[PDB]
């Protein structure tokens, strides 16, 4: 995206650092959610809770991409 | 004339974001501990939901910093 960032380069180093840390966490989390998906439960409540977690994983993924684009455009 | 904000106000918003990041870290440590103390798919699911929300909060704090320091 365009240029013109107006904040500390030091923060831009460290925010990329934490975003990367958050991507690592996310991958490990999607691994845990995957495992939980196939490893065990026949209940409508249980199925719904798992779908809620699985959805939130995607929300977190898209927000990480949003934070990356905003970070390198800002 | 796009942005019109007081420098002191933007500095105090950066502080509030910092304090919220500290709260987040303490929250993630709290969850690491409580998760590590624990066979239920619901309980595991709630734990995964909390971990996700912590990740969401991380990304929104980074977004809030980026949007704040480009205003």
């Amino acid at each position: 995206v365009p240029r013109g960032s107006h904040m500390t380069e030091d923060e831009i180093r460290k925010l990329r650092k934490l975003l990367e840390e958050a991507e690592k966490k996310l991958y490990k989390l999607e691994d845990k959610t995957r495992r939980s998906e196939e490893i065990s439960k026949d209940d409508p409540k249980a199925q719904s809770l798992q779908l809620i977690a699985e959805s939130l994983m995607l929300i977190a993924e898209s927000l990480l991409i949003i934070a990356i684009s905003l970070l390198l455009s800002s | 004339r796009g942005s019109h904000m007081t420098e002191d106000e933007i500095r105090k918003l950066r502080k509030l974001l910092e304090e919220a990041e500290k709260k987040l870290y303490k929250l993630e440590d709290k969850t690491r501990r409580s998760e590590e103390i624990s066979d239920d798919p619901k309980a595991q699911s709630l734990q995964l939901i909390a971990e996700s929300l912590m990740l969401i909060a991380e990304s929104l704090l980074i977004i809030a910093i980026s949007l704040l320091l480009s205003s």
Binding site: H6, M7, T8, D10, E11, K14, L15, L18 | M5, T6, E7, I10, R11, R14, L17, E18, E21, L61, I62, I65, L68, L69, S70, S71
Partner: peptide, 6 residues
């Protein structure tokens, strides 16, 4: 994650 701006 810590900065000032104006």
């Amino acid at each position: 994650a810590a900065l000032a701006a104006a």
